[PDB]
Design an enzyme around this catalytic site. Structure first.
Site, PDB file in Angstrom:
ATOM      1  N   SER D 203    -117.770  41.848  -0.208  1.00  0.00           N
ATOM      2  CA  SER D 203    -118.504  41.484   0.999  1.00  0.00           C
ATOM      3  C   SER D 203    -119.976  41.862   0.926  1.00  0.00           C
ATOM      4  O   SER D 203    -120.449  42.342  -0.094  1.00  0.00           O
ATOM      5  CB  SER D 203    -117.873  42.136   2.222  1.00  0.00           C
ATOM      6  OG  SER D 203    -118.593  41.785   3.391  1.00  0.00           O
ATOM      7  N   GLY D 210    -119.903  48.980   8.769  1.00  0.00           N
ATOM      8  CA  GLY D 210    -118.787  48.818   9.684  1.00  0.00           C
ATOM      9  C   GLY D 210    -117.444  48.820   8.988  1.00  0.00           C
ATOM     10  O   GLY D 210    -116.460  49.309   9.537  1.00  0.00           O
ATOM     11  N   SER D 243    -114.281  37.899  -6.028  1.00  0.00           N
ATOM     12  CA  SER D 243    -114.703  38.754  -4.917  1.00  0.00           C
ATOM     13  C   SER D 243    -116.200  39.045  -5.048  1.00  0.00           C
ATOM     14  O   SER D 243    -116.915  39.157  -4.046  1.00  0.00           O
ATOM     15  CB  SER D 243    -113.921  40.070  -4.923  1.00  0.00           C
ATOM     16  OG  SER D 243    -112.542  39.860  -4.683  1.00  0.00           O
ATOM     17  N   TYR D 246    -118.652  36.917  -3.262  1.00  0.00           N
ATOM     18  CA  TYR D 246    -118.792  37.124  -1.821  1.00  0.00           C
ATOM     19  C   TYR D 246    -119.779  38.222  -1.444  1.00  0.00           C
ATOM     20  O   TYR D 246    -119.918  38.559  -0.272  1.00  0.00           O
ATOM     21  CB  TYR D 246    -117.429  37.408  -1.188  1.00  0.00           C
ATOM     22  CG  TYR D 246    -116.586  36.161  -1.042  1.00  0.00           C
ATOM     23  CD1 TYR D 246    -116.819  35.256  -0.009  1.00  0.00           C
ATOM     24  CD2 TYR D 246    -115.594  35.856  -1.974  1.00  0.00           C
ATOM     25  CE1 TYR D 246    -116.097  34.085   0.089  1.00  0.00           C
ATOM     26  CE2 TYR D 246    -114.865  34.681  -1.887  1.00  0.00           C
ATOM     27  CZ  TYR D 246    -115.124  33.803  -0.853  1.00  0.00           C
ATOM     28  OH  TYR D 246    -114.422  32.629  -0.769  1.00  0.00           O
ATOM     29  N   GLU D 327    -105.216  34.241  -4.886  1.00  0.00           N
ATOM     30  CA  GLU D 327    -105.762  34.696  -3.610  1.00  0.00           C
ATOM     31  C   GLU D 327    -104.671  35.505  -2.893  1.00  0.00           C
ATOM     32  O   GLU D 327    -103.479  35.353  -3.163  1.00  0.00           O
ATOM     33  CB  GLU D 327    -106.166  33.485  -2.774  1.00  0.00           C
ATOM     34  CG  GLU D 327    -107.512  33.571  -2.115  1.00  0.00           C
ATOM     35  CD  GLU D 327    -107.973  32.226  -1.557  1.00  0.00           C
ATOM     36  OE1 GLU D 327    -107.248  31.651  -0.716  1.00  0.00           O
ATOM     37  OE2 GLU D 327    -109.059  31.738  -1.957  1.00  0.00           O
TER      38      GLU D 327
HETATM   39  N1  LIG Z   1    -113.468  38.636   0.407  1.00  0.00           N
HETATM   40  C1  LIG Z   1    -113.219  38.209  -0.846  1.00  0.00           C
HETATM   41  O1  LIG Z   1    -113.752  38.796  -1.776  1.00  0.00           O
HETATM   42  C2  LIG Z   1    -112.322  37.027  -0.935  1.00  0.00           C
HETATM   43  C3  LIG Z   1    -111.384  36.953  -2.025  1.00  0.00           C
HETATM   44  C4  LIG Z   1    -110.499  35.839  -2.167  1.00  0.00           C
HETATM   45  C5  LIG Z   1    -110.529  34.778  -1.228  1.00  0.00           C
HETATM   46  C6  LIG Z   1    -111.437  34.811  -0.139  1.00  0.00           C
HETATM   47  N2  LIG Z   1    -111.471  33.775   0.784  1.00  0.00           N
HETATM   48  C7  LIG Z   1    -112.332  33.777   1.843  1.00  0.00           C
HETATM   49  C8  LIG Z   1    -113.236  34.854   2.037  1.00  0.00           C
HETATM   50  C9  LIG Z   1    -114.223  34.953   3.160  1.00  0.00           C
HETATM   51  C10 LIG Z   1    -114.467  36.164   3.844  1.00  0.00           C
HETATM   52  C11 LIG Z   1    -115.411  36.226   4.905  1.00  0.00           C
HETATM   53  C12 LIG Z   1    -116.109  35.055   5.270  1.00  0.00           C
HETATM   54 CL1  LIG Z   1    -117.248  35.122   6.541  1.00  0.00          CL
HETATM   55  C13 LIG Z   1    -115.882  33.829   4.601  1.00  0.00           C
HETATM   56  C14 LIG Z   1    -114.937  33.792   3.546  1.00  0.00           C
HETATM   57  N3  LIG Z   1    -113.226  35.911   1.125  1.00  0.00           N
HETATM   58  C15 LIG Z   1    -112.354  35.944   0.028  1.00  0.00           C
END
Ligand SMILES: NC(=O)c1cccc2ncc(-c3ccc(Cl)cc3)nc12
Ligand SMILES: NC(=O)c1cccc2ncc(-c3ccc(Cl)cc3)nc12
Ligand SMILES: NC(=O)c1cccc2ncc(-c3ccc(Cl)cc3)nc12
Ligand SMILES: NC(=O)c1cccc2ncc(-c3ccc(Cl)cc3)nc12
Lengths: 350, 350, 350, 350
Positions: D203, D210, D243, D246, D327
């Site tokens: 993230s 948070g 991941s 992201y 996933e």
């Molecule tokens: N978090 C990861 O590393 C992650 C791993 C695998 C699938 C995911 N699919 C959607 C999202 C995701 C999370 C938040 C938002 Cl706002 C949009 C998509 N994250 C993912």
């Protein structure tokens, strides 16, 4: 001459009842005047099966009526049919062929019980049953309906019966701890996997003969690809009725036999749509087909390792599936061993 | 004796043929005994249909098992079937149910030929023939084998004979310029409709006496809606062979009858996928199924206000469709107006 | 000043608005200070087209971050963009790479109106408006708010204003009669095809200079086929508002231009789903996307012959298709003949 | 000063830099002028969530144009944006909302940080670091570079780094062993489930304040399902790169934070085609997305009940799956126990 309990006798015969074996070949419209039990054979049926596949690739690729026609003619030659004075059906409708596949399939077993029985009768032993039962190579161990093991088997049947099969009903009658000819040393290396559970597997009484000579087999190679929903393999259910639906019994024969056994499911690959699987994804061992209803997971015994889905089958979450009930398919004969062989009546609703 | 040009007579007797009708029913696995040819009834059949429609609905909904049971028994009973030594082919597979939809369709005309037949044994002004001739309420006036029409008509036959339709050769034996009494009258309106061309229509010979009598008809309300690829209506092909494939003329009956009629199509509704519909979109007067093969249009001769796709088969340029040839399906018996009837012989290369 | 009807002048002062040009580009996030209006070029934008295309036959065909990253670079350097302190968007969202297509299109037109706008329009005799007129190489004449013509147009306009397009009210200001220098000689062949109708066409006002000069063109080859619903060709509608939603009018600019051309449809290819046409089926001379709604067919009137679909909107019997409304696309530029150019003012609800 | 080891001191300050917070707000074009951090609010963001889903329902259920326009207005009127001189984007792309799901998700945490950062700022003793450290309410300890665990975490990375993610390398700058207060026991009840394993979660950095204080949570009730592929839940990967992506890092901001948590999956309802789940099929606990490529199954490295997918990524039989990589989803937050926190640098070559 004999000693086997009454229930065992009422069985050893059904298996070798050369009489019925005919009324069966008749059901498929065979000219038993050129294709009797005496001239049956795997190697022949196999050629029949192969013709059937050369007809799947026929329509699919789009073939000249000439070709479609020839094929259908050879098939009705290597496998004579007795229609009467009615035009021989066509084999270019997929449904049409599938009908033949089911036919050719139920046959395979037949060729056994006969060729397997058309001999071995010399050393004056005991009544006909003993000379055959002996070649079963299956200790048809007996079970009591008031001891322990059977106690559970009772629960199974009763619950694993679908709501959509209300065209008849069951009635437990005979339980026999059948034990193949050392299929033990075979199903042992297949313990190394989780997922051990007892599921059904019904058939035609005329078949339960070779099901013991060399247990549940998988559609030989020459079988049509699109012949099975999840491919050539051994199929199981966690719903008695559904598996009973594979006994095929009429008002004048509400008395067929079923079977129960455990397979080394390992890590199952569950689909909810039809697929003619060839290779399992690496890591996978079996294939499960999520149906619209299933033995309530919240409740279901187990022990000795194996598992039993004997809970009032309720509705699962899956709602985009094609199946109505579950299915289990493993692809390695050595990944299964038979434990019990029931038998009950089907007192229908004429 | 008789006053119809030789050929017209060989026709009268052929369609009004006694024995063949029975020869046609038997092959359908029908029990002539319990099902006496002289017992067919227009309503007795429509009753049969509805049983089928209910049999296919519940089957396409994995409903209950007491539906096929009861429904199957009923049908076979209403329509006495003599499987002889075979076992009653349950109509569960929702596939063998179609072969049934077919049969009835047939039975429909058989039933009409008979009734129409049995009703003029009174006066005797001419040979039985001529009497049965004034019953078809139609004007069958032979066509001069050596003229434009024959040339046109005959060239049409030859050009739209499709390749994948190899198994039989076609050769025109005689052309008949039929004129159903009044057909001209109801077709009148629809001639103000654009797009109207000569297409083909094959059928069993025991159905023609009733076709020339009451004309082409849609499946009755009682019959299923998933029985015909594009719903209930009158079908037509622009490929001679395609429509000939519906005569069912074998090695034993090497000659059938093909009908050439004028169809008021107009605004056609194209489709490439089978779609069992019950109605046309606004501004739509017909439905046209797209085939991968079609007659080259640059050769569409125009028989004055009417087209004729005598253009040799060619690639339509469509390929994601599931039809190898075109189909035209109208849904108002008035949009049709037969013009020609033809006798042909089938040369098989089996 | 000039001997041009006041109205004709305001149309010119409209199409030839240079400042409004840059404004467009800006809204697109382009860097005028690196990509000045006077710096546009057809090969640049075209070469930009291939990049988007290259992302297609790459992105979804499975790719590598490096590629998308790379191709996105090649693109952004080739065509400057100013996003400020905000990491620029990466091309790989379909919807993302799709706007670039909507972007490039509007761009190819600006360049044409630009290179035209300035190539020799500063002569004595008459002033600029007059000089730039002739540049259009198209006769332009006024129509009266009372001429049977105007009454047809207005009628066509208000009647065919969709119901989902409720974010503005239309109002015809100045109708104009037009005729491109030598288009009649170019449309003469097709002038003898069937199915000719007055279809709409909406475009961004600062694109007209090029259209009234070059006639409606087809998205250059180098554009991804997938960037267009029915392959690359010209698109029209029968719902004024469907093509009007393409005039890109804001409150700032609430007055736009829309076209009424004569299109030679011929044999339409009724498609209800989306496909990226590259070749057409035999006999076919266009394509018509089917939509849920459509003008009432029995309401079709005619001006000088051409079928004009001014029939109030109706529900078509085709409900499943993607499109909410009809569409027409021809793939040869000579099947179109512009007749009327409107000048209407949107009344927004933003 | 702070008594915490410098490395920790760096993460605290990093995940609390009020400047990088603002950089976030601008990344989304949020107008800091009329929408400043201090003005953010739990209620506010939430209300926009409801709106965002309103765009969903109204778009997948159709409506018209006027409404889509009003909801956007209402969205922007809530969360002020400054689109410089470009055209204010319209939300309806069915995924143009997804980008907004992301935004609102970020906003929640960004808001949380700021809030925690002001409920205890006017204190005195040690650097505001130890002051903010305690607010996280989570023990943080450094994992020695040559600590056995370090060799495992690193192995995982280098191994589970996707091949299609060749637009950057990875280096583990820091490794932390965190332990959120309370989470050890709200998870205990799920420690009985089966298939508990180490899975990645990537993230935003401004998002971590948070996350450590509230733990990974599921999108609010107000929030729209359409924003996710398998419905509102907590996601995970087994391909660190998946991941990684992201963390939204760039050539400008190269350092990111990713988590390793042990999730209790139990009985997985394995799918392979995008589906917005609502109810979880009976007996099912988690959800698994099947990928075309997957960590070598026979390389698993268990650590007492908790399995670890550190095996290189190879291919699995699945070929019809819509995903490129696996996933993981759990629909209960108590079903996840955070374990480690890596601080790592990306290395793009652009
Ligand atoms: N978090 C990861 O590393 C992650 C791993 C695998 C699938 C995911 N699919 C959607 C999202 C995701 C999370 C938040 C938002 Cl706002 C949009 C998509 N994250 C993912
Ligand atoms: N055997 C079972 O009890 C059984 C259980 C569950 C599903 C099955 N699906 C297909 C077949 C099947 C039956 C006969 C033939 Cl010939 C081929 C397949 N059997 C099945
Ligand atoms: N007969 C034709 O000339 C004919 C031409 C074209 C399409 C047809 N589709 C279905 C049937 C059809 C055939 C048999 C039965 Cl029983 C019902 C319909 N006939 C067709
Ligand atoms: N042009 C029309 O008036 C028009 C009429 C009808 C359908 C259309 N479909 C797509 C596009 C279209 C519009 C802009 C861009 Cl950039 C690409 C395609 N235009 C259309």
């Amino acid at each position: 001459k004999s000693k086997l309990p009454k229930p065992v006798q009422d069985l050893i015969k059904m298996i070798f009842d050369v009489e019925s074996m005919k009324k069966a070949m008749v059901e498929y419209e065979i000219d038993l005047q050129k294709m009797p039990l005496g001239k049956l054979s795997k190697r022949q049926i196999q050629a029949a099966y192969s013709i059937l596949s050369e007809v799947q690739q026929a329509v699919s690729q789009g073939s000249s009526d000439s070709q479609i026609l020839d094929l259908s003619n050879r098939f009705y030659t290597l496998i004579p049919h007795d229609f009467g004075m009615k035009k021989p059906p066509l084999l270019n409708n997929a449904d049409s062929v599938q009908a033949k596949v089911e036919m050719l399939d139920n046959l395979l077993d037949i060729e056994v019980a006969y060729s397997l029985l058309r001999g071995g009768s010399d050393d004056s032993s005991k009544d006909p049953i003993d000379v055959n039962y002996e070649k079963l190579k299956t200790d048809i161990k007996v079970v009591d309906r008031d001891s322990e093991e059977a106690e559970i088997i009772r629960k199974y049947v009763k619950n694993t019966h679908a709501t959509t099969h209300n065209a008849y009903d069951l009635e437990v009658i005979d339980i026999f701890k059948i034990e193949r000819e050392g299929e033990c040393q075979r199903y042992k290396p297949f313990k190394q996997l989780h997922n051990r559970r007892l599921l059904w597997h019904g058939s035609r009484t005329t078949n339960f003969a070779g099901i013991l000579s060399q247990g549940l087999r998988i559609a030989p190679p020459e079988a049509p690809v699109t012949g099975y929903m999840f491919g050539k393999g051994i199929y199981f259910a966690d719903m008695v009725s559904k598996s009973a639906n594979y006994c095929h019994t009429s008002q004048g024969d509400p008395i067929g036999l079923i079977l129960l056994g455990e397979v080394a499911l390992g890590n199952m690959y569950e689909l909810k749509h039809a697929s003619h699987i060839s290779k399992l994804p690496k890591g996978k061992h079996s294939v499960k087909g999520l149906g619209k209803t299933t033995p309530d997971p919240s409740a279901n015994i187990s022990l000795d390792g194996v598992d039993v889905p004997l809970g009032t089958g309720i509705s699962s979450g899956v709602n985009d599936t094609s199946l109505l009930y579950n299915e289990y398919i493993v692809y390695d004969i050595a990944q299964v061993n038979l434990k019990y062989l029931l038998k009950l009546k089907f007192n229908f609703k004429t």
